[PDB]
Amino acid sequence: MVYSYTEKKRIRKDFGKRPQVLDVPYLLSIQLDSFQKFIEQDPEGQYGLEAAFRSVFPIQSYSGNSELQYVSYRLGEPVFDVQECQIRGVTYSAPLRVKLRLVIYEREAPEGTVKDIKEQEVYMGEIPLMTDNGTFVINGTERVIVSQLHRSPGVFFDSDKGKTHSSGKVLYNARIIPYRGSWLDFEFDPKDNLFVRIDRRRKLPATIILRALNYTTEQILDLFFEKVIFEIRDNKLQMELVPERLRGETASFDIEANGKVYVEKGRRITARHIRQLEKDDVKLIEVPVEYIAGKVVAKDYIDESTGELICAANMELSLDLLAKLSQSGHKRIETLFTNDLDHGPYISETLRVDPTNDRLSALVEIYRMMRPGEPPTREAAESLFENLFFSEDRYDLSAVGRMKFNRSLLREEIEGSGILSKDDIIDVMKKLIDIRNGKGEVDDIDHLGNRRIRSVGEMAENQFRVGLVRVERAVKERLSLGDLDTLMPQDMINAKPISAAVKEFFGSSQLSQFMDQNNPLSEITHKRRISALGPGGLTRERAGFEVRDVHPTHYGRVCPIETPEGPNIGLINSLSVYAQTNEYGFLETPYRKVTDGVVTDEIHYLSAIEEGNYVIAQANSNLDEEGHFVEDLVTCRSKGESSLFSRDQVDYMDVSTQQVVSVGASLIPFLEHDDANRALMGANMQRQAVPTLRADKPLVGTGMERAVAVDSGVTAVAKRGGVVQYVDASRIVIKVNEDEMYPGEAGIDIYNLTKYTRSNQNTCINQMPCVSLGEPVERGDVLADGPSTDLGELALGQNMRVAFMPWNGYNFEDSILVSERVVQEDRFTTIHIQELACVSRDTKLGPEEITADIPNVGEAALSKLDESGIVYIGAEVTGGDILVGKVTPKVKDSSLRVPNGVSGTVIDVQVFTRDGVEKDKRALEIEEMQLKQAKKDLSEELQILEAGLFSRIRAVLVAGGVEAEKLDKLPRDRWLELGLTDEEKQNQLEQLAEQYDELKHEFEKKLEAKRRKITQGDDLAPGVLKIVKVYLAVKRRIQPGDKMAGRHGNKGVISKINPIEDMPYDENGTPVDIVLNPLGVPSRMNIGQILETHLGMAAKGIGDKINAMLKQQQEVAKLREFIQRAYDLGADVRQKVDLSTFSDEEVMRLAENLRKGMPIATPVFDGAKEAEIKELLKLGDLPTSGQIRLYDGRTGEQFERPVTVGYMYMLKLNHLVDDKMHARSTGSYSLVTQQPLGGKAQFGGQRFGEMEVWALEAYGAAYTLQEMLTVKSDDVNGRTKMYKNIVDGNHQMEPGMPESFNVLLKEIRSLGINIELEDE
């Protein structure tokens, strides 16, 4: 057994029992391997930019009769890396270069070119790149593309009751949904006439398509219907009985011959009669003329002699018609079999709607129904009809759509073309008619086998296609008209349409979300959201219980708990922990192979429609350490049904008890106990915790923290193994070991940590070291904590000591009462960093300046600016302080002032300048910083190679060919001028001094390039001269009104900040830190929070025994004994750990991190039994009831009965109150109508909205209302007369008439509608 060097510092005591056979996949492979799938070229041309190019090129005009064609593409390295790009505020992007070859043919000749011109990689655009954290950077702002989930291409059959006609019956419908191009709907009319339409246009008679494909009705009838024949021999019109065509229906008429009668008139027909029908060989039989007089004919019948019609396919027969046509010599008359149950006549019925004659008349009807007002025309019509279904420019089932289609038509194969074909539509019709004949089933729409995930690497491939589609339309014309003589490919194309397409996508699409960089969980659970909304999806306002609800295939694929309750429940889901995207995009999830009777430890991923074909055991099911099930019969799910089945009947097993959830819920301990309301609100509140100041560890967790904090990319992780060379909380630098070094390198990995910086939500993000100088580290160890982490565990909140009890009502209803001790400790203080910016311009009156020489202001304000016109770093500032002394010509003091209300310390400034514009000493101050920071880190390589190279001189001197009359005092390349002879050592000296010079020249260009990065200005917007951004850090504390939450979806405002003496304290005199209310636990059934408290209490107790054993100077062998006795506690828990191997050093180093509570894991559905919590509390010296008697610090009286006390984990949420408290006396008003502005970002007035006005009207209160909506609001006179009457204290109003109502009058009178006020 082994633990990595960052595990072996706080080995979380694990209570899990099921052995985790599959370790959690890298939590963002959803995203990264999607974008990698876009960005890689791939000669198997599907997927990626290359697939899109090969979707358009080769490209040509017929009249140009020449082409240009895509050869290959290259993607250059990005002009600025992520860190610098995120400073400079551009987007992190890469230049796209494409080998286009233009080919010039000739007339008359064979096509052999007159010339062709490979343009040496024409520039095509700048595609953004994904950062390894899975995020794009789009205008310095960091953005995330959520995966979409939408209806896969294919064919889908559907039906409903009551939603249509409601006379008990149901109507059936088929759709073909291509990936790109037109939708085709087939549907029956109630009277089972069949109809078709494109793109939800008008309804058409369905055979209009078969007509359009030029089947005659005779052929259609041979495609759809079974034949029944009459042979006019042995007697007039004998009949071809196929026996099985009579079963269950009544023999209402005479059928007999030759010996035993099968079934006489009026009786059902059955098997024994059919067998007698077979044994008599009923190949022809006598039937009454009423039977033939029922028929509809199959085939066309002219009279050959007159040459003229008597009957036609699907025309209906009668005795006299039969007589004349058989009399005309047509001795075989042929018709259809149409039993109403099994063979309904729907296509013949459709031929009774049909207005068409044949192909052309249908194409006429198509073109007139689709493009009303354009002329139909034989040469023109096909340029509609073919581009509906048969042409690549406008119809495309991708490979997934073809697969799904073929699977539903039960085809043998799935390598198929993306267009339809005649037989491809006909098969849909046949399958739809089988459904109406009752012999088939409709698909469940909302099934994760019918909806597939699209992620970034596919949405961007489509938007890039829209680009190439608009270049198609330009380049075809330019090629067709062009001379082909001077044009080269970089004339043929230009980037602007591609760049528009892809930049608008990544910038502004409904799915290019601005990342919730709130804390490391919220980064991740956002990068793996599954969204039903957006382009090609549904809409949040326009769906109902059919899709919001969970479905049985969600299990293991989508988390049922973690969805953002509100107007879009379940239109957003979170992709479950273990789930994965299949090749095609369907969600698939891993299961264990059950081989005969033993659970084999191999995992097969199952998609949602493989799963229904097996029976799959629930993850809890026990096994015998050989791996046979222990239970003789076991719970499994099967076909959405679940029940018990035999041992060795079951065929797959779940991989882990965590498989059903997302990371967002998988982090709740004891989730096994909570109402799924309160699980949901928990798993939504964890992603809102703001990173507190001094974050640590949850004492009770699930062991998922060790993964969320690492995979979220925000802790800095050791890229290669080695030893810590230096640390200073800004840099960490690692001497990588030679077993993982690359041979020419210096061999030294710096990590410049990010310090105090705004998150996208204004919380700070300073990384801090966890290493010590000279400490060893191994690849993948956490070197530095992120925000909200410590030692690499996720740590949103603080393990506050809580007791559950009423307290004089301060924790009524939900509220949290808090002791002053928590605020004094800086437990929940949090740092909020704002960014304020002053732009400056080349305006129409002339160019602005930044200066201290501001007009109309004296040193009373300017004392905080430097001499340049920017605030000093470390200035502490408040409302109205001038941060940046901008001025405008013709001079106007427009300067950046700190907005009202806010306050903070100015932690940093940045300065950006156009080209050809002068700097200033705060630009030179920033240059001095950044230059020096680049140069230092470069020197720490050049120094290391210089030292190595002079050793490489010294050693091969000192070992042999010594010249050491004096040695180390000398400049170690002046060592060359010593008198060594022209034996090889002097030539080694000369060569290695040339290697030393070239080592200098190497950095002599590397530092020049770096300084050139810093020396330059930046790509400002048009009009601006320069911009400066100034950052205010605020250390906000905690106060009444702030919100805190547990993990269990318990939440409250904190209501009072009680002084320590008022907190309850125990029989040992320690006060409780928080007092939660009890009644929420039964009333909202989230009792898992109690077991977290008790297990938390035990967690404190073990640290309590350890801390005592470190204050007392216990020897390690006794201390190790107690720690070991803690890890081995419980049943056959999964984990094993041997402090015997920890070398004493690391036992003390471990104890020094347990000494405030042993951290515990309670994996989600696999937790501690109660009997193991008691066992831990008994190992501490604690009361196993979990409860303690408490006393009230207001009197020292005892409380009656003990109360729960223990260490809950509590999160401060980002809804803290000073960010919401607001009030307005008077200020701005809007221009169009004079009502007040609305906001906090503007000094706004609260909306006395519509419902409040009914509320006043429902008291008698008329004067209040009159005021509220005029004098206080709108009447431009009355409010200034009111204000003066109030300062005069007159308490009287003059109410007038609101100017918004006069706006209405003019806006009506701006129609030709004379509205007017009237007098009497």
Partner 1 sequence: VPLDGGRFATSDLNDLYRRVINRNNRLKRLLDLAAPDIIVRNEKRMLQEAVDALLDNGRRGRAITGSNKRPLKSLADMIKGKQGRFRQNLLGKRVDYSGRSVITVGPYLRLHQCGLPKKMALELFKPFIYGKLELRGLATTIKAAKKMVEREEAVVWDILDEVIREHPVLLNRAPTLHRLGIQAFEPVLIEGKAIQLHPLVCAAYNADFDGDQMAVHVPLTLEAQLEARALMMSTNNILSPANGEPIIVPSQDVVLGLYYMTRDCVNAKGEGMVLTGPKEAERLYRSGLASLHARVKVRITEYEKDANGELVAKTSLKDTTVGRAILWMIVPKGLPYSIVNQALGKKAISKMLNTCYRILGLKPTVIFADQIMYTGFAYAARSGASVGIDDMVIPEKKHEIISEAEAEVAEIQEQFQSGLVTAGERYNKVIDIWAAANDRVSKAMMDNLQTETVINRDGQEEKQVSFNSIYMMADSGARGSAAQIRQLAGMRGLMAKPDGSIIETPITANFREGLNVLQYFISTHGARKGLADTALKTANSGYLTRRLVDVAQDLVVTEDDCGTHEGIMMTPVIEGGDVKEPLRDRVLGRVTAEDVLKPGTADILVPRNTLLHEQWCDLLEENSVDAVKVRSVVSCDTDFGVCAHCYGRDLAR
- Strand, helix or coil at 463? helix
Q: Quick check: 294 binds DNA (CB under 7 A)? A: no
Residues 366-405 that bind partner 1 (CB under 8 A): none
Q: Which does 123 bind (CB under 5 to 8 A by kind): DNA, partner 1, none?
A: none
Q: Which two tokens stand for residue 1048?
A: 């269990």
Residue position matching structure tokens 């005021």: 1267
Least distance between partner 1 and beta carbon 1293 (Å): 5
What is the SS3 assignment for 305-332? CCCEEEECCCCECCHHHHHHHHHCCCCE
Q: Quick check: 1233 binds partner 1 (CB under 8 A)? A: yes
- Per-residue x/- track, 1147-1166, partner 1 (CB under 8 A): ------------------x-
CB distance 620 to 561 below 8 Å: no
Residues 6-65 that bind partner 1 (CB under 8 A): none
Choice between 167 and 258, CB closer to DNA: 167
Q: Quick check: 1247 binds partner 1 (CB under 8 A)? A: yes
Least distance between partner 1 and beta carbon 97 (Å): 29
Q: Quick check: 26 binds DNA (CB under 7 A)? A: no
What Å distances lie between residue 883 and 531, 764, 861, 1211, CA to CA? 42, 21, 10, 34
DSSP annotation of 861 reads: H
Q: Quick check: 879 binds DNA (CB under 7 A)? A: no
Q: Which does 1185 bind (CB under 5 to 8 A by kind): DNA, partner 1, none?
A: partner 1
Q: Tell me how many residues contact DNA (CB under 7 A).
A: 47
Cβ atoms within 10 Å, residue 397: 26
Q: Which does 1282 bind (CB under 5 to 8 A by kind): DNA, partner 1, none?
A: partner 1
Q: Quick check: 536 binds partner 1 (CB under 8 A)? A: no
Q: Which does 551 bind (CB under 5 to 8 A by kind): partner 1, DNA, none?
A: partner 1
Q: Quick check: 1079 binds partner 1 (CB under 8 A)? A: yes
Q: Which amino acid is at 880?
A: G
Query: Cα–Cα distance between 680 and 1209 in angstroms, integer?
Result: 17
| Distance, CA of 346 to chain centre | 46
Choice between 429 and 1027, CB closer to partner 1: 1027
Q: Which does 163 bind (CB under 5 to 8 A by kind): DNA, partner 1, none?
A: DNA
Q: Quick check: 1244 binds DNA (CB under 7 A)? A: yes
Least distance between DNA and beta carbon 183 (Å): 5
Q: Which does 677 bind (CB under 5 to 8 A by kind): partner 1, DNA, none?
A: partner 1
Q: Quick check: 804 binds partner 1 (CB under 8 A)? A: yes
Q: Quick check: 184 binds partner 1 (CB under 8 A)? A: no
Q: Calculate ∠ Cα 667-672-678, nearest 5°.
A: 70
Q: Quick check: 1234 binds DNA (CB under 7 A)? A: no
Choice between 76 and 879, CB closer to DNA: 879
Query: Cα–Cα distance between 565 and 571 in angstroms, integer?
Result: 10
Q: Which of 811, 761, 1317, 715 is nearest to 1053 (CA)?
A: 811
- Per-residue x/- track, 338-377, DNA (CB under 7 A): ---------------------------------x------
| Stretch of residues binding DNA (CB under 7 A), selected from 570-578, 586-594, 941-949, 1234-1242 | 1234-1242
Q: Quick check: 666 binds partner 1 (CB under 8 A)? A: no
**Residue positions counted in the chain:** 1320
Query: Cα–Cα distance between 934 and 1180 in angstroms, integer?
Result: 53
Least distance between DNA and beta carbon 177 (Å): 8
| Distance, CA of 853 to chain centre | 51
- Per-residue x/- track, 621-650, partner 1 (CB under 8 A): --------------x-x---xxx-------
Cβ atoms within 10 Å, residue 1287: 8
Q: Quick check: 541 binds DNA (CB under 7 A)? A: yes
Q: Quick check: 1176 binds partner 1 (CB under 8 A)? A: no
Least distance between partner 1 and beta carbon 24 (Å): 17
Q: Which of 523, 639, 687, 654 is nearest to 578 (CA)?
A: 654
Q: Which of 890, 896, 1128 is nearest to 1027 (CA)?
A: 896
Least distance between partner 1 and beta carbon 1186 (Å): 6
Residues 1008-1027 that bind partner 1 (CB under 8 A): 1023-1024
Q: What are phi and psi of 43, to 5 degrees?
A: -55, -30
Q: Which does 1116 bind (CB under 5 to 8 A by kind): partner 1, DNA, none?
A: none
- Spatial CB neighbours of 123, under 8 Å, sequence gap ≥ 6: 95, 96, 97, 98, 490, 495
Q: Which amino acid is at 521?
A: L
Q: Tell me how many residues contact partner 1 (CB under 8 A).
A: 156
Query: Cα–Cα distance between 1105 and 1119 in angstroms, integer?
Result: 10
Q: Which two tokens stand for residue 1111?
A: 């204050």
Task: Please pick, from the candidates 162, 626, 743, 1259, the single residue that binds partner 1 as defined by CB under 8 A.
Answer: 1259
| Stretch of residues binding partner 1 (CB under 8 A), selected from 473-481, 568-576, 940-948, 996-1004 | 568-576
Cβ atoms within 10 Å, residue 372: 8
Q: Which does 473 bind (CB under 5 to 8 A by kind): partner 1, DNA, none?
A: DNA
- Per-residue x/- track, 442-471, DNA (CB under 7 A): ---xx----x-----------------x--
From first CA to last CA, the distance across the chain in angstroms is 97
- Spatial CB neighbours of 554, under 8 Å, sequence gap ≥ 6: 448, 560, 573
Choice between 797 and 1236, CB closer to DNA: 1236
Choice between 744 and 1249, CB closer to DNA: 1249
Q: Calculate ∠ Cα 380-382-384, nearest 5°.
A: 85
Least distance between DNA and beta carbon 141 (Å): 5
Task: Please pick, from the candidates 1251, 1258, 1313, 1317, the single residue that binds DNA as defined by CB under 7 A.
Answer: 1251
| Distance, CA of 57 to chain centre | 32
Task: Please pick, from the candidates 1039, 1124, 1135, 1153, the single residue that binds partner 1 as defined by CB under 8 A.
Answer: 1039
Choice between 189 and 941, CB closer to DNA: 189
Q: Quick check: 141 binds DNA (CB under 7 A)? A: yes
Q: Which amino acid is at 288?
A: P
Choice between 234 and 546, CB closer to DNA: 546
H or E segment and range at residue 290: helix 289-292
Query: Cα–Cα distance between 343 and 338 in angstroms, integer?
Result: 5
Q: Quick check: 1283 binds partner 1 (CB under 8 A)? A: yes
Choice between 1 and 1251, CB closer to partner 1: 1251
Least distance between partner 1 and beta carbon 1295 (Å): 10
Residues 370-389 that bind DNA (CB under 7 A): 371
| Stretch of residues binding partner 1 (CB under 8 A), selected from 673-681, 742-750, 931-939, 1027-1035 | 673-681
> What DSSP line would sit under 726-753, residue for residue?
EE-SSEEEEEE-TTT--TTS---EEEE-
What Å distances lie between residue 489 and 76, 99, 464, 1242, CA to CA? 19, 9, 19, 52
Residues 177-196 that bind DNA (CB under 7 A): 182-183, 189
- Strand, helix or coil at 1003? helix
For the stretch 480-486, contacts whose Cβ atoms lie closer than 8 Å and that sit 24 or more positions apart, written own/partner, are 480/61, 480/63, 480/64, 481/64, 482/64, 484/64, 484/66, 484/104
Footprint of DNA on this chain (CB under 7 A)? Answer: 138-139, 141, 150-151, 163, 182-183, 189, 199-200, 202-203, 371, 445-446, 451, 469, 473, 496, 507-508, 514, 535-539, 541-543, 546-547, 567, 762, 1220, 1222, 1238-1241, 1244, 1246-1247, 1249-1251
